Design a protein around this ligand. Structure first.
Ligand SMILES: CNc1cc(-c2ccc(OCCCN(C)C)cc2)nc(S(C)(=O)=O)n1
Length: 111
C-alpha cells in the first residue's frame, strides 16, 4: 500500500521519478520556488507553496517516510498552480500536462 515505509531501494526510484519531472519540457514553472516578481500576490493566495527543488532537498535528506507523503507534496504543486491560475492559463496547462506525466511515472514506480 502507499503507507508502506520507504526503503533505500524505493528512494532510488523516487530520485528517478523526480529527475524525470525536472527534465520535462513543461516543468519549468515548477523547478524552483515561485519568485514574487513572477507572480503577483502569489504568497498571499497560496498558503502552502511547494516546488521541485524543495522536494529534491527533501529526497536527499530522507524527509519522506511513506510514499503518500511524496505524492502529497507533488499534488500541492499542481493544486497550487490550478488555484492560483485560471484554467485559461498556459501555466494552468503546464500543470495539466505534468500531472498526467507524474501519474504515468508513479504507476511505474508502484509496479
Ligand atoms: C503567472 N502565473 C504563474 C507564473 C509562474 C512563473 C513565471 C516565471 C517563472 O520563471 C521565469 C524565469 C525566472 N524568473 C525568476 C524571471 C517561473 C514561474 N508560475 C506559476 S505556477 C508555479 O503556479 O505554475 N504561475
Amino acid at each position: 500500500s502507499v503507507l508502506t515505509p520507504l526503503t533505500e531501494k524505493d528512494y532510488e526510484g523516487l530520485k528517478r521519478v523526480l529527475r524525470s519531472l525536472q527534465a520535462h519540457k513543461m516543468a519549468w514553472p515548477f523547478l524552483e520556488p515561485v519568485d514574487p516578481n513572477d507572480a503577483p500576490d502569489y504568497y498571499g493566495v497560496i498558503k502552502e507553496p511547494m516546488d521541485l527543488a524543495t522536494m529534491e532537498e527533501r529526497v536527499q535528506r530522507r524527509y519522506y517516510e511513506k510514499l503518500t507523503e511524496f505524492v502529497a507534496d507533488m499534488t500541492k504543486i499542481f493544486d497550487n498552480c490550478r488555484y492560483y491560475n485560471p484554467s485559461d492559463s498556459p501555466f494552468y496547462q503546464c500543470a495539466e500536462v505534468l500531472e498526467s506525466f507524474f501519474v504515468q511515472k508513479l504507476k511505474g514506480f508502484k509496479a
